[PDB]
């Protein structure tokens, strides 16, 4: 059987990559950061409580101005908040209430959303009439929309439960490039700072680094034991962190092509739903199923703080571009700003 | 300058919450339902009798609004997207009475899911007329696929329909007890299963959901007062 030889040759290549990564593992991240001083006890406080959502909140995204933010709740509403004054700027009724992700364009002129409808809907916020209307409905995915991120006003990358990711041309509404490497539901994606690459996390316990313009899977990262639910790039773009149902957070390096650190504790037995780094990348914030958010030391793997304000599962979190505050969404229909 | 901009934001905020108040009474008044089942379980026939990733079906019973959703273009991996239906009033699980063992395993996963622990399940044991034809024939026996059926006896609490063979009654109630054994194992008084012997062309399926939903809302209010 030629397939059995292809099964045999695959094991040879996986054994070659494993030994190639072992040769580069001279010293671990803990040994390098063994002499640096710890960050200490991080005690953030809830400064704002955003109230108005009628159902569980699934996703949120900060604007580039670090003031406005959009939130997606399964009641069929997209709300744009002014985090400074807690005032609602826009309330967008959705055609499908089963939204699972939302995005804020870097220019602040558009917002995106999607979910079980398998459609990524683009909404125009800067219409001269003064209302917010859908400008484009991106269809073509055969699974639920799990995450979406704007590259610019005309390009957006999406992840879907059909095990594929896609690059969309908003003007034409057609898929420019399709990424078909994963074997399970792709749950989240994270764009590089220069938007040349992006990483995705799927339900195959593996993460993949993609080339946006080339459309190829450059590196595949393994080490997790369960489905990866969240992913976030390091501020420098040379590393990223993942959150999975195995109650562990892991840090992977692109140039090293292997895992550097694992963030877990024996008292944590619930899966991670969202991950994000601080501005400097020293702190790794992660949302958990146990209604709590844990602040990890990205260099020493030490838990530095706990954000316990929500009454239900924390589904999403995000740090502002200026690093001033951290937002947290949860299934209790509330958003909380932490400083 | 600074006074005109902030005041324009406050008037825009109070206009939004004014609309959100109208959306709240509409959202809280309708009861959302999730329809689940195999491709040949008969759920599609119940929808028409009352591409896209999810279908919507809105019916009204005694001026009470219901919003039943049907899963469309989604893959067979359900462990992720099924978490979105944790706040629905009930999950309508349609089973074609070894496809039966596969439905029993799916029911066990839904019943024991961490996020679905507080969601009741309306069990529609569909295709009761097709089950009777197979039991009366005697060619396809159940005990070869369920050895405990040979030693199974019809419960005296059963309500057989007038003019029905006892072999059909013992067969359909054995399948019901297979689902009830899973529900009564981890019920914990948080959620309950409502089994029903239904057909695809039954007009009573709407009334069964309305009566079961009324019982679910009643048990929720009784739990908030810690009466049950």
């Amino acid at each position, epitope marked *: 059987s030629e397939l059995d030889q292809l099964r045999q040759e695959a094991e040879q290549l996986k054994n070659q990559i494993r030994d190639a990564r072992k040769a580069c593992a001279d010293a671990t991240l803990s040994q390098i950061t063994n002499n640096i001083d710890p960050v200490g006890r991080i005690q953030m406080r809830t400064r704002r409580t955003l109230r108005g959502h009628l159902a569980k909140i699934y996703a949120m995204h900060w604007g580039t101005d670090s003031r406005l933010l959009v939130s997606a709740s399964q009641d069929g509403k997209l709300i744009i908040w002014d985090s400074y004054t807690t005032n609602k700027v826009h309330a967008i009724p959705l055609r499908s209430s089963w939204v699972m992700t939302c995005a804020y364009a870097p220019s602040g002129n558009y917002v995106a959303c999607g979910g079980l409808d398998n459609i990524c809907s683009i909404y125009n916020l800067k219409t001269r009439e003064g209302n917010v209307r859908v400008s484009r409905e991106l269809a073509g995915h055969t699974g639920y929309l799990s995450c979406c991120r704007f590259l610019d006003d005309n390009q957006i990358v999406t992840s879907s439960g059909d095990t594929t990711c896609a690059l969309w041309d908003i003007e034409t509404g057609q898929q420019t490039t399709t990424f078909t490497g994963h074997t399970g539901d792709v749950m989240s994606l994270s764009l590089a700072p220069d938007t040349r690459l992006f990483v995705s996390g799927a339900c195959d316990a593996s993460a993949k680094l993609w080339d946006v313009r080339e459309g190829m899977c450059r590196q595949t990262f393994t080490g997790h034991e*369960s489905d990866i639910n969240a992913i976030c790039f390091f501020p420098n773009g040379n590393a990223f962190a993942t959150g999975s149902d195995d109650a562990t957070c892991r840090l992977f390096d692109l140039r090293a092509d292997q895992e550097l650190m694992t963030y877990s504790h024996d008292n944590i037995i619930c899966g991670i739903t969202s991950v994000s780094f601080s501005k400097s990348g020293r702190l790794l914030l992660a949302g958990y199923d146990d209604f709590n958010c844990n602040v990890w030391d990205a260099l020493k793997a030490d838990r530095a703080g706990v954000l316990a304000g929500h009454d239900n599962r924390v589904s999403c979190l995000g740090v502002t571009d200026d690093g001033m505050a951290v937002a947290t969404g949860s299934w209790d229909s509330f958003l909380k700003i932490w400083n | 300058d600074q006074r005109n901009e902030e005041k324009a934001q406050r008037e825009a905020n109070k206009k939004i919450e004014k609309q959100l108040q109208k959306d709240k009474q509409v959202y809280r008044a309708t009861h959302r339902l999730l329809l689940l089942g195999a491709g040949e379980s008969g759920k599609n026939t119940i929808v028409k009798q009352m591409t896209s990733g999810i279908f919507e079906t809105k019916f009204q019973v005694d001026k009470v609004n219901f919003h039943m959703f049907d899963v469309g273009a989604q893959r067979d991996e359900r462990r992720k997207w099924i978490q979105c239906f944790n706040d629905v009033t009930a999950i309508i699980f349609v089973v074609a009475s*070894n496809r039966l063992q596969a439905a029993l395993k799916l029911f066990d996963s839904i019943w024991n899911n*961490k996020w679905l622990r507080d969601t009741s399940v309306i069990l529609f044991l569909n295709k009761q007329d097709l089950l009777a034809e197979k039991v009366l024939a005697g060619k396809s026996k159940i005990e070869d696929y369920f050895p405990e059926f040979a030693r199974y006896t019809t419960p005296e609490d059963a309500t057989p329909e007038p003019g029905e063979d006892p072999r059909v009654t013992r067969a359909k109630y054995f399948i019901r007890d297979e689902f009830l054994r899973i529900s009564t194992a981890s019920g914990d008084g948080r959620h309950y299963c409502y089994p029903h012997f239904t057909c695809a062309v039954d007009t009573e399926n709407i009334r069964r959901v309305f009566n079961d939903c009324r019982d679910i809302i009643q048990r929720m209010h009784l739990r908030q007062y810690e009466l049950l």
Partner: nanobody, 128 residues
């Protein structure tokens, strides 16, 4: 890297006996519930049996109850399936399927056509 490799099995006489083994690696074997699934020629994937994390909770499908025996060795990270009184109906490719999430009583999607936490399977043929 989650890896599941099935071993044992093959051609056997009707009424014979076989012992399947699944070597698990890349995850904490003691924290996951294990399953056995099979796919007959021209048929879909079918759940056969499962075993809890510790091994107290054990269930089988109706067709193999009394003939098949499932067990696990947490120290060796190995899943076992003792098949006795094999019939020609048992001819199928047998896969060892792990539940997707640890410390969970539910086990979703283990019979889906494309499941990540499932081995490549081993061929078991029962014929005279």
């Amino acid at each position: 890297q989650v890896q599941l490799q099935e071993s044992g099995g093959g051609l056997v006489q009707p009424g014979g006996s076989l012992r399947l083994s699944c070597a698990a690696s890349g995850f904490t074997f003691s924290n996951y519930k294990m399953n056995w699934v099979r796919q007959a020629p021209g048929k879909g994937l079918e759940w056969v049996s499962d075993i809890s994390q510790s091994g107290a909770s054990i269930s089988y499908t109706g067709s193999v109850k009394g003939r098949f025996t499932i067990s696990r060795d947490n120290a060796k990270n190995t899943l076992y399936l003792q098949m006795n009184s094999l019939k020609p109906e048992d001819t199928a490719v047998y896969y060892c399927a792990r539940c997707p999430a640890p410390f969970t009583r539910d086990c979703f999607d283990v019979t889906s056509t494309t499941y990540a936490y499932r081995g490549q399977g081993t061929q078991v043929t029962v014929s005279s």
